[PDB]
């Protein structure tokens, strides 16, 4: 048993390392999103630095986790990352819809990590993803939210164009 | 269902419209108290200021659960805020006091509204209301108690006059 | 009769208390008006910033006024502020016409508040109410009126998110 | 029942005065190993340096609670608190070792308090312990461990002589 | 026989250790002290800022000793610090009154301590002892005397508040 | 075909798409062994801070190479990035072998991409490869030899605590 471990319970520390996966996951996801938009038939830049820094911070969440995973003396176990699920993102609404589904679906993973954490009696872990990850999470998707409202009001074309000059930096 | 809507129940949807509410109260009870104070007859300066600095706190209390209402994909409705239960408000003693007992109902408000989003399994929400709320109320409870013990400790006349300029900026 | 009591009748210092509740009332609707379009269905950042600073404005009309009901040696009597109008403000062309409507709503109630003080011969209420409260409306007036002709002009979609963008800080 | 008690329960508000003993008797340990790495046949620097700043850390952890205890309208009653359990504390790897074992009753403690002020309902409590005393204890430990791994690591001898000036300020 | 040892004495080397347990007793007691003042039905933060500082320079007085116990090659040997003798302090005059009480108290020790030096011919030991605590406590005492007299001054009520604000920062 | 495509092969393309996972399994290798040194029982800071900017050294070249994609008018094609081949990586020395060669390999797949783009004639890609790859492989190699050579000089132990001291930041 590693020095550290205290209250660490072995099914929270399966989580922690499925949801490094999932991080890895929405990372790629990102990364894939954002380099589709560097495609010179959709050249959005907006929607490319979005998502590049999308993927920086799902990078984040999962080295944050593998930081945790060993701080409470859990051992990562890395799986694949799988590829994204699709290879073309659409439009600029269509990415941003699915980025929500893949917040949202982080989100989910989350909750359920911290209903793991919390079943088990993991005070600290439960706190951990409060601060670091469900609050971001429902940032996130606040954000992409409106996003898609306005990728919607926008329209296509000009408009798609000047939500990626306006709304994104 | 609202695009960001995750994990987000109707009762925590009405408990944090009916919180925003009773905010909005306290910032109309301490505004009331602040100009109260500011009567010419009542004059203490002091006293104006905290209260007028309280009231800004509880509409910040109130528009951050309006925030949270729009994050986690509620809808905010308004009630009617009722006028406070006084026009006037005694002495300082007796403002600290309706203070102190405005303060604990809020906070016996943000608990409850915990043990909504306790029993909907809201995790985010209950770290959002411990983070935000439930630690500035005990701060501003311990704080008004504070005051309270001073105002009496000090007495009427020149001590509430010395209370004003003293304990208050 | 309060100490500072000088050529201050009953009635202006009653319709001061009303005047109050609407500037609250103004408050609360422009507050409503805010959070609306932090809604993610409507995600109008703009409006919710430039209502959120009108909300503020109208805080500081109602409180000008208890001070100034205090400064005359007038008794603020508060009441139930209502909850605005409506749940929902539509576009961004509704919020301000709804806006439009309310404003000249208090500028009429400022008018009103003025004959008060000018058939009482309230010299100083009078000069009050037109420097601080009456040239303002006028300026608010001229500026949603402003708006609301640019909203029209930049129609649904795109241009609304235009309007949001450059028309709103 | 003091003025700010609220949702403040007799048992954690004991339970808050046994780790408040806890942490003091944590602070004189750290307090002690420091002094004993002073030791002219000891002379450990860095050692004596680290563990003062634990000592001080754990006097700032009683101190937190003495003044949470407050705030919560709870009453600070003090205990002897006890000598460490050794005077001398071995090698520096001992010390570590020691220090780990006492950081994680500490810990142990804490997650005790935790689910004393669960059972409670104490949610602000809860959030208290999270934020201000599992985190810190779960970093405290992984970084003891870590020293603990190292000191292992270097040896007796040099190896300890390098630790205490490269791994310790 | 450790190495720095010269001209210390095994009586001398036990009077030190005695005297750190004193030191942080006295610690432990204004440590109490701080946060009695601190409770919200005592709410005197001059007194509770005030307490604790001394406690804090009584923890470096115990920490000096230790550190000068190593220096001369003592082996520092803690013991229970015993909880203070009362766990509520009365008004600021009584607090004040039981501070110079301890502090007498230490002074004597101190005193006695510096006996023991000077029949065992410490020389160096006297002049740390004169040096680094008689004279402090020299004017601590006076300090705490004056605070005393003030106290009685004052009288209970608005001077004691009074007495919080201008006499203690 | 796409609007930049000009000299750029489908090979060629297809090879940078295989690279891009190579990088990312780089990318990730690095990440787990930084994270692997992080291990409370491995606990080795320079370790970790030296892989993880490897790490973040892959992920740049990854992302150089899907950028470099789009600048050609080929279509980034991401596949899973396989879990690293080991868990645990061994000793300092044994991680720093590992990532001898994974360089190497990655070295070879970056000239056996060359080839490609020289047999295709590709002078742009080849200059790209050269000047952003192969170069940096090659000084990365020579550090990594450099490192695996003092591991080995140092020895277990002290050794390896001080080279992760002194060589590694
Ligand atoms: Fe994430
Ligand atoms: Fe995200
Ligand atoms: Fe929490
Ligand atoms: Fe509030
Ligand atoms: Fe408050
Ligand atoms: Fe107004
Ligand atoms: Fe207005
Ligand atoms: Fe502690
Ligand atoms: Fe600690
Ligand atoms: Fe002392
Ligand atoms: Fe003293
Ligand atoms: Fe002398
Ligand atoms: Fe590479
Ligand atoms: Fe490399």
């Known amino acids: 048993e590693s020095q550290p471990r205290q209250n660490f319970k072995v099914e929270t520390e399966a989580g922690i390392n499925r949801q490094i996966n999932l991080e890895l996951y929405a990372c790629y996801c990102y990364q894939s999103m954002s380099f589709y938009f ?12 979005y998502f590049k820094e999308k993927s920086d911070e799902e990078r984040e969440h999962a080295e944050k986790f593998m930081k945790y995973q060993n701080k409470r003396g ?12 699709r290879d073309e993102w659409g439009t600029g609404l269509d990415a941003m819809q699915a980025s929500l589904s893949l917040e949202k679906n982080v989100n989910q993973a989350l909750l359920d990590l911290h209903t793991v954490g919390d079943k088990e009696g993991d005070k600290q872990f439960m706190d951990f993803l409060e601060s670091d990850y469900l609050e971001e999470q429902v940032e996130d998707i606040k954000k992409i ?25």
């Open 74 to 85: 859990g051992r990562i176990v890395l799986q694949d990352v799988k590829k994204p699920d």
């Open 38 to 49: 560097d495609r010179d038939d959709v050249a959005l830049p907006g929607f490319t630095k």
């Open 145 to 169: 939210s409106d996003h898609i409202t306005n990728l919607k009001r926008v329209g296509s074309g000009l408009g798609e164009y000047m939500f990626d000059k306006k709304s994104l930096d």
